[PDB]
């Protein structure tokens, strides 16, 4: 077994902490047991892990999870709400070959929403569920119990985990609600990274990233807004404040409407990045294996497919997917004594109404 403690920092996350403990073999059962928790400016998460890598003789794994999660949306630069949740996951893992693995699982989650600041898109989802709270009060509550079928696919042919120079990584994760759940929806996420070395020593690499998200309701319901996709920040569209890209809250009057610059995410998302990895100027060859310079072009959009631009014609059409943000800049990664580090400086050359800018972004990791 082992335990660990992490400390880190990010521009969007603030000072972050992590700790965990794992019993390598829980009293002869062969199921590894673990307890992990992490915390940053807007999220507190904890779990109990219970996994066995050889549930069957030929590799199939059996995984259990029991989790608690506290999410402060205002501190993740969204319109304000509080989501406290807990649940369990049972996941089977099937390695198809050397570069592919599949996973299927059944999950239960309880979400307890509170402290929701009235806005059109959020309330629209509440209306689809049959919930009609006051539009002038921030002292509300919404609770749901959901059962989900979760599938996943990971392709990994990366030459190296730290600082890849060749190969691709693809991760597709989906879920759908099982009838009987309070929510009725599906949700799909696709992430890709492709490294192409353009020189023999693999110091000059071209990197293409894509990230896609789509989900909608079933049966006249919508997707819960706390399941929304976002874009902007250090890992999606650099130079943009975290989560700023996409629809903005259209606030209900307190006790007619008000446009805002508070992003609310959305149920469709698309991000793409083109990055040129180079050797690092002004650093010795002794410290090459531990640093990575790159120059990038980032873009992304987020939209709300159920935005009703008829009822709200005086506002921007938030269902519009074509308002594509763009940025360009230089990044620096360093495997520092304080852990994996990442500087980035980016100029958002293409931005839209209410998009907030974060030119300098900085991250020290706490997991590696």
């Amino acid at each position: 077994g082992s335990f660990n403690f992490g400390i880190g920092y990010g521009t969007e996350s603030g000072v972050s902490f992590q700790a965990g403990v794992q019993q390598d073999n829980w009293l002869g059962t062969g199921y590894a047991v673990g307890i992990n928790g992490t915390k940053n400016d807007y999220q507190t998460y904890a779990e109990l892990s219970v996994t066995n890598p050889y549930f069957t003789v030929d590799g199939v794994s059996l995984g259990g999870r029991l989790f608690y999660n506290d999410f402060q949306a205002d501190d993740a630069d969204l319109s304000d709400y509080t989501n406290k949740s807990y649940g369990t996951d049972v996941t089977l893992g099937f390695p198809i070959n050397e570069y592919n693995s599949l996973r299927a699982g059944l999950g239960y989650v309880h979400n307890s929403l509170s402290n929701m600041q009235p806005q059109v898109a959020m309330w629209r989802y509440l209306y689809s569920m049959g919930e009609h709270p006051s539009t002038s009060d921030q002292d509300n509550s919404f609770k749901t119990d959901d059962f989900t079928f979760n599938y996943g696919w990971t392709y990994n042919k990366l030459d190296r985990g730290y600082f890849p120079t060749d190969g691709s990584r693809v991760n597709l994760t989906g879920k759908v609600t099982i009838p009987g759940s309070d929510n009725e929806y599906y949700k799909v996420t696709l992430d890709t990274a492709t490294y192409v070395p353009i020189d023999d020593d693999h110091k000059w690499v071209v990197l293409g990233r894509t990230r896609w998200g789509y989900g909608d309701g079933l049966g006249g319901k919508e997707m819960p807004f706390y399941e929304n996709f976002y874009a902007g920040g250090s890992s999606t569209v650099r130079g943009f404040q975290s989560n700023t890209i996409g629809p903005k809250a259209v606030y209900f009057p307190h006790q007619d409407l008000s446009k805002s610059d508070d992003a609310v995410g959305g149920n469709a998302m698309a991000v793409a990045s083109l990055e040129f990895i180079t050797p690092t100027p002004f650093i010795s060859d002794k410290y090459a294996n531990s640093v990575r310079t790159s120059f990038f072009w980032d873009m992304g959009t987020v939209w709300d497919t159920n935005w009703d631009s008829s009822q709200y014609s005086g506002y921007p059409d938030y269902s519009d997917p074509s308002n594509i943000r763009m940025s360009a800049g230089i990044a620096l990664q360093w495997m520092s004594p304080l852990g994996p580090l990442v500087f980035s400086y980016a100029q958002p050359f293409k931005k839209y109404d209410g998009d907030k800018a974060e030119q300098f972004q900085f991250n020290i990791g706490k997991t590696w």
Partner: peptide, 7 residues
């Protein structure tokens, strides 16, 4: 930073 201590 991450510190890992096998017991």
């Amino acid at each position: 930073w991450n510190w890992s201590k096998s017991f």
